[PDB]
mmCIF file of C-alpha atoms and ligand atoms in Angstrom:
data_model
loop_
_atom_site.group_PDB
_atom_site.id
_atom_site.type_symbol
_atom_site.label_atom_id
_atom_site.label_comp_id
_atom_site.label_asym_id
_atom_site.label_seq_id
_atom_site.Cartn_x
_atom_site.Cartn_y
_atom_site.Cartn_z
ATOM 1 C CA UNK A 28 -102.590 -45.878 -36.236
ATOM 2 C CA UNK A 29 -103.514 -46.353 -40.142
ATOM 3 C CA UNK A 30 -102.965 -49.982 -41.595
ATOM 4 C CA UNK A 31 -103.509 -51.389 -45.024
ATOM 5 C CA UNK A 32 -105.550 -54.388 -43.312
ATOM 6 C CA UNK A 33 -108.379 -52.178 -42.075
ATOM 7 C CA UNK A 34 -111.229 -53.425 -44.543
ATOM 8 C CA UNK A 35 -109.802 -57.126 -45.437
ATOM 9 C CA UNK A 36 -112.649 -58.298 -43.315
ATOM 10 C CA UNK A 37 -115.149 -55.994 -43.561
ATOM 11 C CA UNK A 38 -114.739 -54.855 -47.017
ATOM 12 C CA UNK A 39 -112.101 -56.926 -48.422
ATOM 13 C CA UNK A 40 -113.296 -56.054 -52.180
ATOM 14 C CA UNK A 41 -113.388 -51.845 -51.885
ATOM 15 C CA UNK A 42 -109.859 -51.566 -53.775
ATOM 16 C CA UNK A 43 -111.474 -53.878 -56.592
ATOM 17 C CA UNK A 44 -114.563 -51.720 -56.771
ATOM 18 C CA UNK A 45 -112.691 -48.127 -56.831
ATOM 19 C CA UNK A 46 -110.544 -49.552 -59.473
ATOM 20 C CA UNK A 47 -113.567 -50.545 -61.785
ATOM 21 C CA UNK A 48 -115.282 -47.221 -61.127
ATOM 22 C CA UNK A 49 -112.056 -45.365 -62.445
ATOM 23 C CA UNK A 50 -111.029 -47.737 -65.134
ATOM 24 C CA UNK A 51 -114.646 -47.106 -66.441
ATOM 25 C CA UNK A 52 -114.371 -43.582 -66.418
ATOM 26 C CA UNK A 53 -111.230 -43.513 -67.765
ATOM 27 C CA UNK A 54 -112.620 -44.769 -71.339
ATOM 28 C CA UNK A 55 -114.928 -41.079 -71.604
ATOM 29 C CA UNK A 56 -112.403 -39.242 -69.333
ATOM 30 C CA UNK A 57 -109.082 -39.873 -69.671
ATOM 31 C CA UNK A 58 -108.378 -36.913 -67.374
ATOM 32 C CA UNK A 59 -110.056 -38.390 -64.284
ATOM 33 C CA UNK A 60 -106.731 -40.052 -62.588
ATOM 34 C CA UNK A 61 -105.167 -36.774 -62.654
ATOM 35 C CA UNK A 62 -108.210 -35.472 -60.979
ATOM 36 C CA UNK A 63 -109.090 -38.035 -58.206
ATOM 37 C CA UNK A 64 -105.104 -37.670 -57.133
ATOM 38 C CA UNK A 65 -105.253 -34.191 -57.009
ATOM 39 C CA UNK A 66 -108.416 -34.048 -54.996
ATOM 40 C CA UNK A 67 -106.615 -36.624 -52.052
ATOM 41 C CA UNK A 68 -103.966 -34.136 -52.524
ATOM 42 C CA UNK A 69 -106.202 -31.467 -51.728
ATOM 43 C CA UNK A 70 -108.471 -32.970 -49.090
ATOM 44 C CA UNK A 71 -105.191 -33.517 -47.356
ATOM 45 C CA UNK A 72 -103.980 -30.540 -47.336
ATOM 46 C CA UNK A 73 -106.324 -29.226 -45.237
ATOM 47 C CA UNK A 74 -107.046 -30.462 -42.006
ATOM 48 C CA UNK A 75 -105.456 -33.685 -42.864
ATOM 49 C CA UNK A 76 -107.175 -36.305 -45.166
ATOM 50 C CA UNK A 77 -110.648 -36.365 -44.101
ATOM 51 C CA UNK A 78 -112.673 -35.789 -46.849
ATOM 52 C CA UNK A 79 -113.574 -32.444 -46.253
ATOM 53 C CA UNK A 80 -112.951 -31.338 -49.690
ATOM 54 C CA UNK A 81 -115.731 -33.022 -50.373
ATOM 55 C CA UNK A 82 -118.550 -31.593 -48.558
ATOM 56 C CA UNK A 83 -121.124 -29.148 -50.109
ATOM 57 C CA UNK A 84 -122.144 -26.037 -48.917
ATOM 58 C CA UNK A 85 -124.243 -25.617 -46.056
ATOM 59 C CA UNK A 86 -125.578 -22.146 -44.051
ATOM 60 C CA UNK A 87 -123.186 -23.020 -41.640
ATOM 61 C CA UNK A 88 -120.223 -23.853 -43.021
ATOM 62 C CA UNK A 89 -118.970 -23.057 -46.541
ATOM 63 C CA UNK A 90 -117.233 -25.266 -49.029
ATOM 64 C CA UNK A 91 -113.945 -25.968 -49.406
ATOM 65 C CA UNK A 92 -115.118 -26.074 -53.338
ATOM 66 C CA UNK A 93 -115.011 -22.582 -53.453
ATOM 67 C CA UNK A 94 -111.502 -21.806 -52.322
ATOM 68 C CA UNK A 95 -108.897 -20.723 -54.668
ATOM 69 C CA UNK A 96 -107.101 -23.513 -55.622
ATOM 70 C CA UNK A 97 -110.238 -25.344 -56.012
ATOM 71 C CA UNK A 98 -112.765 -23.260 -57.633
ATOM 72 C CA UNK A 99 -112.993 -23.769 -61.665
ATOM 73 C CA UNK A 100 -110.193 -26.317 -60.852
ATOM 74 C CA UNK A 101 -110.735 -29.080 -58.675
ATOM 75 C CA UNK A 102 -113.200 -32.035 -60.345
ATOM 76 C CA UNK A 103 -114.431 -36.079 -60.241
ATOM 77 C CA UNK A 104 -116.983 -35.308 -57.811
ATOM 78 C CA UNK A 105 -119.490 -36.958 -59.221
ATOM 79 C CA UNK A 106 -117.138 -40.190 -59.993
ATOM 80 C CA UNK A 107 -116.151 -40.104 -56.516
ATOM 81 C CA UNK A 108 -120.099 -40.375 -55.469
ATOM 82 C CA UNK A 109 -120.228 -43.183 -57.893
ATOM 83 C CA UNK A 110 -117.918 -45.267 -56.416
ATOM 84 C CA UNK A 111 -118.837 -44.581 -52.778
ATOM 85 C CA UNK A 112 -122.442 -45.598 -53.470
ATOM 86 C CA UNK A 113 -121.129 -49.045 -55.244
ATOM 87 C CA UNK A 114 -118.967 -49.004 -52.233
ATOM 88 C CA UNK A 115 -121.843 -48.737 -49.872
ATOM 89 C CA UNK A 116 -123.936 -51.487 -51.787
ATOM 90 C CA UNK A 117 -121.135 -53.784 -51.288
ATOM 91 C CA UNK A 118 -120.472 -52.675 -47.818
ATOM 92 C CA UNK A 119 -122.841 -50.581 -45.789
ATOM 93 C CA UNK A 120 -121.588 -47.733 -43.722
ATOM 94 C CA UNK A 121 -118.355 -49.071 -43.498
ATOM 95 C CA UNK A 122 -115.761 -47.015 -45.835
ATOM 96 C CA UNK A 123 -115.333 -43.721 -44.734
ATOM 97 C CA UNK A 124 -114.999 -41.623 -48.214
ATOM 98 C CA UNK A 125 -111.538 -40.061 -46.306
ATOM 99 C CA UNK A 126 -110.435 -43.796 -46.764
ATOM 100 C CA UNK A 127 -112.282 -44.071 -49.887
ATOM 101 C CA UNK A 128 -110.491 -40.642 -51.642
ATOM 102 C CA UNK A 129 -107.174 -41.985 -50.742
ATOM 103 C CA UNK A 130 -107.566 -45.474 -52.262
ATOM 104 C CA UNK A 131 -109.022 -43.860 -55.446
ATOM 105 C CA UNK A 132 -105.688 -41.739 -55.415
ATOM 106 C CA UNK A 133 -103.809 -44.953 -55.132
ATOM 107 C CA UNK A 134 -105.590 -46.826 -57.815
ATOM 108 C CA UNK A 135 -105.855 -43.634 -60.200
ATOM 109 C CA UNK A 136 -101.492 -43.572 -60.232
ATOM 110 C CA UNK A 137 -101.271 -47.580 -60.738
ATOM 111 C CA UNK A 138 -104.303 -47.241 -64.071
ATOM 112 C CA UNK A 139 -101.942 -44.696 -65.044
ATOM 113 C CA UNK A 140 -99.035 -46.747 -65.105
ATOM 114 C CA UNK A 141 -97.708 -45.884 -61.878
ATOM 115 C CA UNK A 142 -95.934 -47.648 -58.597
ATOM 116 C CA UNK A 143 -98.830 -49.801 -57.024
ATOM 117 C CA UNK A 144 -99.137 -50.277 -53.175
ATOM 118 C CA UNK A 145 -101.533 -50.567 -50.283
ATOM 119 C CA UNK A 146 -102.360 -47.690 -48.659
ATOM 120 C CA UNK A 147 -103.142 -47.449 -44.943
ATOM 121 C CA UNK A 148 -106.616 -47.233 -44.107
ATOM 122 C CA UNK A 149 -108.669 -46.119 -41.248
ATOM 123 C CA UNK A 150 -109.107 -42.643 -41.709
ATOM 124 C CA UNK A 151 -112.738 -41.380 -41.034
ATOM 125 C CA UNK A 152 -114.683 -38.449 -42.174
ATOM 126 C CA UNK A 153 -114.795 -34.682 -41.009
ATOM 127 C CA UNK A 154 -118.026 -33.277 -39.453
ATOM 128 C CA UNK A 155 -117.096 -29.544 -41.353
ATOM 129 C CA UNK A 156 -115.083 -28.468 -43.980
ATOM 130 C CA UNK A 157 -113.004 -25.580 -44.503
ATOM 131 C CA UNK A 158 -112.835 -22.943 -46.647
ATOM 132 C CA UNK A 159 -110.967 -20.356 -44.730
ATOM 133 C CA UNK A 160 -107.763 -22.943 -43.982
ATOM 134 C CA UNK A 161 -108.006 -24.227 -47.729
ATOM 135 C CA UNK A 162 -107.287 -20.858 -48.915
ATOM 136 C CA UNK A 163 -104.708 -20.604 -46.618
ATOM 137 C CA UNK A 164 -103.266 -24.252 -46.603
ATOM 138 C CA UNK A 165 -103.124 -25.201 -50.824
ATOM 139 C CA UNK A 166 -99.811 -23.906 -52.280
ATOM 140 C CA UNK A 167 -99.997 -21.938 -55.647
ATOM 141 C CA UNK A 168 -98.383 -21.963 -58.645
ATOM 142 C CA UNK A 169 -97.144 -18.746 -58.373
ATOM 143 C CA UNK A 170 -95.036 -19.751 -54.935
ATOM 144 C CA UNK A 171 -91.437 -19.318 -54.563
ATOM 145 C CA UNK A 172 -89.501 -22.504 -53.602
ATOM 146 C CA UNK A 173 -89.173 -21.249 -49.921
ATOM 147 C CA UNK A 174 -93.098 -20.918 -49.823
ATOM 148 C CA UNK A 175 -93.590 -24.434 -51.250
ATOM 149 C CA UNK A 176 -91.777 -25.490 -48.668
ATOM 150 C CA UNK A 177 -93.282 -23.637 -46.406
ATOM 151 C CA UNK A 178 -96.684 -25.246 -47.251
ATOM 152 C CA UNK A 179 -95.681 -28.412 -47.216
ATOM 153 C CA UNK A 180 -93.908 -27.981 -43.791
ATOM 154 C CA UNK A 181 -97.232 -26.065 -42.890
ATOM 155 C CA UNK A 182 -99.396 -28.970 -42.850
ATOM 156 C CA UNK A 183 -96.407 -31.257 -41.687
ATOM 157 C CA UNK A 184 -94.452 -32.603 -44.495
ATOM 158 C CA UNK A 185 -90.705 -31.306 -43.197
ATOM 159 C CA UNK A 186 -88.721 -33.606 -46.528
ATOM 160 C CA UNK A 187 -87.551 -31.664 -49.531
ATOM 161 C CA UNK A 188 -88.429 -35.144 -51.054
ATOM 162 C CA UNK A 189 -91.977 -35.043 -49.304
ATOM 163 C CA UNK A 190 -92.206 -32.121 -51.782
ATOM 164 C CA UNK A 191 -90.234 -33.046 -54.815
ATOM 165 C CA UNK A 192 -91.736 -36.542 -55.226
ATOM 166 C CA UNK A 193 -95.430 -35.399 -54.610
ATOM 167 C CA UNK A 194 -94.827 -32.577 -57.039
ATOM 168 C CA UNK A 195 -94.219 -35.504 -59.773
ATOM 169 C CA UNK A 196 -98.077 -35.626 -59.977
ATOM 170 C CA UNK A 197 -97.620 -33.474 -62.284
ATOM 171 C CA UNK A 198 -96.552 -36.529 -64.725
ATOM 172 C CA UNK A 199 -100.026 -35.922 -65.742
ATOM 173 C CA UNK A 200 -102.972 -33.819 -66.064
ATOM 174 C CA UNK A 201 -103.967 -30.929 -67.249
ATOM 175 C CA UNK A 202 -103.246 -26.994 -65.993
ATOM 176 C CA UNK A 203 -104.727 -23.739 -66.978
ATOM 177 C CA UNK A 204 -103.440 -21.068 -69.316
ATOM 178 C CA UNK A 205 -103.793 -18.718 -66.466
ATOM 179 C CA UNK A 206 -101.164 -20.111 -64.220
ATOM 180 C CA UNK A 207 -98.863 -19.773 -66.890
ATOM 181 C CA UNK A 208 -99.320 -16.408 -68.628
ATOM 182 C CA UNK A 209 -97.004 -14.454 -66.273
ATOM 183 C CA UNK A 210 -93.949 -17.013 -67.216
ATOM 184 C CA UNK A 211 -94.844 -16.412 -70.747
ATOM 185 C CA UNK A 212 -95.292 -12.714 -71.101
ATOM 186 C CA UNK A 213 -94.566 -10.746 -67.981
ATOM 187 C CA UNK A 214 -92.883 -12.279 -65.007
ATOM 188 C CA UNK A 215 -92.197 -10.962 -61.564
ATOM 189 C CA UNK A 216 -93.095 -7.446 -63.945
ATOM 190 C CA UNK A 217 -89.799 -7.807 -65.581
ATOM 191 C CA UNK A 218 -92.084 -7.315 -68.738
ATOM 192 C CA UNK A 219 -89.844 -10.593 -69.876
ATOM 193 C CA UNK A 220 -90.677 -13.818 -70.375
ATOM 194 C CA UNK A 221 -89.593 -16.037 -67.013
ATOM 195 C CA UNK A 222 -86.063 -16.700 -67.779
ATOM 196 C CA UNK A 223 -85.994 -20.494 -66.365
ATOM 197 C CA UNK A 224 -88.237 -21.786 -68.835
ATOM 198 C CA UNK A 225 -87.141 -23.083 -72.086
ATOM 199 C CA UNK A 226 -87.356 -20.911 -75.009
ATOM 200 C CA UNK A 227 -88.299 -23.455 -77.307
ATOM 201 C CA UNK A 228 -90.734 -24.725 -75.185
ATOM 202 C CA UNK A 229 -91.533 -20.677 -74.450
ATOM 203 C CA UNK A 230 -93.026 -20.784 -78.119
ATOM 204 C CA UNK A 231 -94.738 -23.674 -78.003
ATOM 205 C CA UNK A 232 -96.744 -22.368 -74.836
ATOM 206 C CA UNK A 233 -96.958 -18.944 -76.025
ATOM 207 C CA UNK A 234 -98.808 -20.549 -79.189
ATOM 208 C CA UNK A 235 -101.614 -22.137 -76.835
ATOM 209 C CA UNK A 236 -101.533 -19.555 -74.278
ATOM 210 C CA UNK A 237 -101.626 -16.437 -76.350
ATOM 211 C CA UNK A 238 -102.067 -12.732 -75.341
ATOM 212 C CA UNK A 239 -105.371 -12.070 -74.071
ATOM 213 C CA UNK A 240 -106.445 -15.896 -75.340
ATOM 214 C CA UNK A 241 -108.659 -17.901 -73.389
ATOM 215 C CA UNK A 242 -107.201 -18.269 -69.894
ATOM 216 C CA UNK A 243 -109.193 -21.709 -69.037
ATOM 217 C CA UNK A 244 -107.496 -23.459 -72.394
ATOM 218 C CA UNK A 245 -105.856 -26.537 -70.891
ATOM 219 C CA UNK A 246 -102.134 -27.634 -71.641
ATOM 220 C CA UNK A 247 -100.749 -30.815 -70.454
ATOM 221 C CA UNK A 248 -98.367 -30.877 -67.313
ATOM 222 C CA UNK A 249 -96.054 -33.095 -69.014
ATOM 223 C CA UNK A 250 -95.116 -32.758 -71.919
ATOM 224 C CA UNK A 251 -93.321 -36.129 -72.840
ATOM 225 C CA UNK A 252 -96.227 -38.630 -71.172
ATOM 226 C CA UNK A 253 -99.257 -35.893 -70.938
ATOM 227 C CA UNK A 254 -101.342 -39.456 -69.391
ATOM 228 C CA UNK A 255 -99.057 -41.361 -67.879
ATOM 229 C CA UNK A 256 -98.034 -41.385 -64.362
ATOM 230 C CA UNK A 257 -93.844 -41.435 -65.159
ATOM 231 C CA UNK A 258 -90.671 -40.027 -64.579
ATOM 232 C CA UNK A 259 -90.596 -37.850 -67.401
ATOM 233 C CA UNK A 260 -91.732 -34.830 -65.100
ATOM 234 C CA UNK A 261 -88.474 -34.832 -63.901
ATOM 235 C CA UNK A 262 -86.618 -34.774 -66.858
ATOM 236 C CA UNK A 263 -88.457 -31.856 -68.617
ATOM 237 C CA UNK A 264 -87.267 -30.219 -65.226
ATOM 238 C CA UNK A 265 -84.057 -30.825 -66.056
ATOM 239 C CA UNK A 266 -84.493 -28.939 -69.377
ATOM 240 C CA UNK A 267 -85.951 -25.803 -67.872
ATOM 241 C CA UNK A 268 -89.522 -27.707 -69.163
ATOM 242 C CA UNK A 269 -91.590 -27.624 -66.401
ATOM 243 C CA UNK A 270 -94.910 -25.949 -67.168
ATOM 244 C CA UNK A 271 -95.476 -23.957 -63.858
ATOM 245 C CA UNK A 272 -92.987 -22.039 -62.103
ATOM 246 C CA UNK A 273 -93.580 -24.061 -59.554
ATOM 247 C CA UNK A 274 -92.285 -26.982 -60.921
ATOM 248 C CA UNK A 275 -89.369 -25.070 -62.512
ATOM 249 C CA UNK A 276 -88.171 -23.844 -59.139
ATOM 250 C CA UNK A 277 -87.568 -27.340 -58.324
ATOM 251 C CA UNK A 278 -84.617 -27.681 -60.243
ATOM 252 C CA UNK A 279 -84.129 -23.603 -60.711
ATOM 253 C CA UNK A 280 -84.819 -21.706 -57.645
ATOM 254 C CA UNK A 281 -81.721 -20.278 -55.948
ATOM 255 C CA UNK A 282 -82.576 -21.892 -52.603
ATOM 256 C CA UNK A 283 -82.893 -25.550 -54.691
ATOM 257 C CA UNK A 284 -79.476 -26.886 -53.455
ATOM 258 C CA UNK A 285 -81.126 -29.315 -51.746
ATOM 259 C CA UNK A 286 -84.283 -30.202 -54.033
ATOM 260 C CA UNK A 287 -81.929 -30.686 -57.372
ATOM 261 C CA UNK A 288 -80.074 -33.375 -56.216
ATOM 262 C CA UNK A 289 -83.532 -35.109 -55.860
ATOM 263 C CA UNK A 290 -85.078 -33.884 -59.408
ATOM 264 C CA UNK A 291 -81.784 -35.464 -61.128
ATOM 265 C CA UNK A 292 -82.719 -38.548 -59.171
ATOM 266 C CA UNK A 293 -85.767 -39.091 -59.684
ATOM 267 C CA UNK A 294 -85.341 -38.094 -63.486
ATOM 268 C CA UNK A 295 -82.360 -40.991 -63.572
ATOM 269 C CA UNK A 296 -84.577 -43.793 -62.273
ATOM 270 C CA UNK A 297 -87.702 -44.840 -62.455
ATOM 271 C CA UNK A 298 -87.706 -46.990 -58.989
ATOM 272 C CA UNK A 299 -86.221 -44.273 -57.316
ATOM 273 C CA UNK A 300 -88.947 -41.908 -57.993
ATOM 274 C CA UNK A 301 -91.827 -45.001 -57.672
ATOM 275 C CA UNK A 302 -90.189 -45.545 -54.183
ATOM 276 C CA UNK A 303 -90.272 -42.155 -53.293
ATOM 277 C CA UNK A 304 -93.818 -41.403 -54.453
ATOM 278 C CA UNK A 305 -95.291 -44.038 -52.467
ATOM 279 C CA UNK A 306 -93.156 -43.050 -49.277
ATOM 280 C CA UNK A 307 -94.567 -39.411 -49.799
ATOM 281 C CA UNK A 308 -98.120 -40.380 -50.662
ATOM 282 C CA UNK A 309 -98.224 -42.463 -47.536
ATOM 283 C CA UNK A 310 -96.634 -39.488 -45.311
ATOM 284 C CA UNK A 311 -99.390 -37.255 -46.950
ATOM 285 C CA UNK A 312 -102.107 -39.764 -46.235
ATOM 286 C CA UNK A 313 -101.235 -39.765 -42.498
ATOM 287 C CA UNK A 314 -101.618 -35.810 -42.099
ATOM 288 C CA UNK A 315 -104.177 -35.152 -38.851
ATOM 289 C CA UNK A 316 -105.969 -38.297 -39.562
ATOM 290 C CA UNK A 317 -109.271 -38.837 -37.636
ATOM 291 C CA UNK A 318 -109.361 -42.195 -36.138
ATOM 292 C CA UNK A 319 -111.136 -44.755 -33.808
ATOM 293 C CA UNK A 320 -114.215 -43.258 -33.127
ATOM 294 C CA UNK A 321 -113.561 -39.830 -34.068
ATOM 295 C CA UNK A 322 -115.608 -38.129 -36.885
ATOM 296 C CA UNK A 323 -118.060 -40.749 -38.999
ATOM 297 C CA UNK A 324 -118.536 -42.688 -41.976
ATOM 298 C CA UNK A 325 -120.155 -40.382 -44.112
ATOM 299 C CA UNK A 326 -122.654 -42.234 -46.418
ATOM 300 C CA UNK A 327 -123.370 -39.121 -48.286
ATOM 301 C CA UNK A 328 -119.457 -38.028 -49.092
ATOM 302 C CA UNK A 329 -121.329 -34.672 -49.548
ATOM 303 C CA UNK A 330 -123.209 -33.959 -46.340
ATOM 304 C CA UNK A 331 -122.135 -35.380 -42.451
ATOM 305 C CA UNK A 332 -124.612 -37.872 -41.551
ATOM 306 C CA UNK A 333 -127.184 -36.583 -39.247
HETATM 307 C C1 HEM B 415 -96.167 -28.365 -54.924
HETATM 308 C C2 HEM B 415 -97.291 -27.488 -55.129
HETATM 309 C C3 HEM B 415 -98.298 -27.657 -56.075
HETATM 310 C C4 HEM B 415 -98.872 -26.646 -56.779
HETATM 311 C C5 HEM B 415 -98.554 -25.158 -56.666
HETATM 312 C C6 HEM B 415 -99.848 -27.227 -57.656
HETATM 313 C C7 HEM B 415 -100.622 -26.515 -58.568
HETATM 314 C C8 HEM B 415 -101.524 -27.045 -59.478
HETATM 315 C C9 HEM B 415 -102.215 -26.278 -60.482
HETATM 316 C C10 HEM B 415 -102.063 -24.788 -60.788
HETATM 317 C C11 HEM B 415 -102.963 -27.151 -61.195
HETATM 318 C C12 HEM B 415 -103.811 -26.773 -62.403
HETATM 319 C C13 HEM B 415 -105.283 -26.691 -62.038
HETATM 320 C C14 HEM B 415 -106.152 -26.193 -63.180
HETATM 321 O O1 HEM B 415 -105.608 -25.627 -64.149
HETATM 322 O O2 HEM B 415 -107.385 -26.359 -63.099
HETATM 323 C C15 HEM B 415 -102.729 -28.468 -60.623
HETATM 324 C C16 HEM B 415 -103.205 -29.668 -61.153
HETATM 325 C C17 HEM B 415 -102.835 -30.950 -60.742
HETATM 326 N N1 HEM B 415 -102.017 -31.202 -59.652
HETATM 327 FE FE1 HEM B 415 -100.829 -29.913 -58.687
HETATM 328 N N2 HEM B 415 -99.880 -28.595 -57.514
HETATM 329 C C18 HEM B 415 -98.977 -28.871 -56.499
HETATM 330 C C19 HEM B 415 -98.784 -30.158 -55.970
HETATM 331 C C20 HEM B 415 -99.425 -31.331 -56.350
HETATM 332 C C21 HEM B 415 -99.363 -32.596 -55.628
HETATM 333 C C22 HEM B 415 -98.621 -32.797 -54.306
HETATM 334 C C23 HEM B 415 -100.158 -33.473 -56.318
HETATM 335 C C24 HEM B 415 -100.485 -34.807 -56.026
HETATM 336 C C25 HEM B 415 -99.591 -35.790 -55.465
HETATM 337 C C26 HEM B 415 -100.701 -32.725 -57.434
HETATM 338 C C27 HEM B 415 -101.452 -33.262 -58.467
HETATM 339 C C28 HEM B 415 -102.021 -32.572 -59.524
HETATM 340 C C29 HEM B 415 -102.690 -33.187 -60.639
HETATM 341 C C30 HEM B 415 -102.668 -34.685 -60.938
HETATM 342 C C31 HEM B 415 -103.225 -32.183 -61.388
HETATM 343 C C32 HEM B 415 -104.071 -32.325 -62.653
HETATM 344 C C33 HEM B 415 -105.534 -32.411 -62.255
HETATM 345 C C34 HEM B 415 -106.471 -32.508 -63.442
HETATM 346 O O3 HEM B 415 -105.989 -32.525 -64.594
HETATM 347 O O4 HEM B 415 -107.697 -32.570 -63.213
HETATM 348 N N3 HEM B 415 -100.297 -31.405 -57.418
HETATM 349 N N4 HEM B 415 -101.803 -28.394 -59.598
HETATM 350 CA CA1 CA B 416 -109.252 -32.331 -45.685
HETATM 351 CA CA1 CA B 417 -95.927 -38.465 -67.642
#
């Protein structure tokens, strides 16, 4: 089983050292905590948290890079080799970058203001990764609330507050015009605007998401705290605000009897959320987990060892 203790004596400094590679980065790329939690959230998601995500291409395999959720999208690769080679400097071939993702996830919510916690450890790397199941596995933002559940529960995350916490990474970040130009100008091919998001806000979006605009402009997930990791998600929720329909169907969706209760929650209190989070996160981070003596410590988080 995953414990927090599993480097104290063989690496006892690798939090420190992932939190100075991020707080670094953070000063040219305030973007990059966003990033490095949506990439554990990603690796995760497929075939459980073993950094898979993070393998290149190879003629054997392809990479998970290129799937749909992750292509044009996913980024902090190189920050994430960064940190695993100051990683392996201070500790050779001990930190498996599965372990290594996941603590960078952790760290990247705390710099951002967020709930701060030790996260088990003793995951270990993947010897493939997996385009085919990534395409299949990461939810879209598209997705109906029954088929964000159904993801979630896909990969074994049963709680409506598995999913309505984790979805409160979108405190932060950024997000693509293109997921949003059906809400704003044709939805479901009603030809109409969707009807659960704000008008007000409607405007605003339509203004930086125009007709025909450039679809890779990026808006900010939250509108309130655009960088920091808060509970502000929540309340734009609550005000038909969220940016993705998605997020909206949270609160919206007609099958969100039992996922409201948890958005007003979480928008009421900041602890409750924080203490949600964290129990999420560390339900995510034990998905299929490779342990013991299974799979490696990649020194390379791009390539298995060979
Ligand atoms: C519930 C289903 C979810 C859907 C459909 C979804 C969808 C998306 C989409 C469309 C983007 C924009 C990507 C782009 O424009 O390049 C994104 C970004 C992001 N997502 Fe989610 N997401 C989901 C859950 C989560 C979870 C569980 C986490 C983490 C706990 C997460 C964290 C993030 C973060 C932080 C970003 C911003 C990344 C950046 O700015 O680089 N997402 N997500
Ligand atoms: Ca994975
Ligand atoms: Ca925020």
């Amino acid at each position: 089983q995953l414990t927090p203790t599993f480097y104290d004596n063989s690496c006892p400094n690798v939090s420190n050292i992932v939190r100075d590679t991020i707080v670094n980065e953070l000063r040219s790329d305030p973007r990059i905590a966003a990033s490095i939690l949506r990439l554990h959230f990603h690796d995760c998601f497929v075939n459980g948290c073993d950094a898979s995500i993070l393998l290149d291409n190879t003629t054997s395999f392809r990479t998970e890079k290129d799937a749909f959720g992750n292509a044009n999208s996913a980024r902090g690769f190189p920050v994430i080799d960064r940190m695993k080679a100051a990683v392996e400097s201070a500790c050779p071939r001990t930190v498996s970058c599965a372990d290594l993702l996941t603590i960078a996830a952790q760290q990247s919510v705390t710099l951002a203001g967020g709930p701060s916690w030790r996260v088990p450890l003793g995951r270990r790397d993947s010897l493939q990764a997996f385009l085919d199941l990534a395409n299949a596995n990461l939810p879209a933002p598209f997705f109906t609330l029954p088929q964000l559940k159904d993801s979630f529960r896909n990969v074994g995350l049963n709680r409506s507050s598995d999913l309505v916490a984790l979805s409160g990474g979108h405190t932060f970040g950024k997000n693509q015009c293109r997921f949003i130009m059906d809400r704003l100008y044709n939805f479901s091919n009603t030809g109409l605007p969707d009807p659960t998001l704000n008008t007000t806000y409607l405007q605003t979006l339509r203004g930086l998401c125009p007709l025909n605009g450039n679809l890779s402009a990026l808006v900010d997930f939250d509108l309130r705290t655009p960088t920091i990791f808060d509970n502000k998600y929540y309340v734009n929720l609550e005000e038909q605000k969220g940016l993705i329909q998605s997020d909206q169907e949270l609160f919206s969706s007609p099958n969100a009897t039992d996922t409201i209760p948890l958005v007003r929650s979480f928008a009421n209190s900041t602890q409750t959320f924080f203490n949600a989070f964290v129990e999420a996160m560390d339900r995510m981070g034990n998905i299929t987990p490779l342990t013991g003596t299974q799979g490696q410590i990649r020194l390379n988080c791009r390539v298995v060892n060979s």
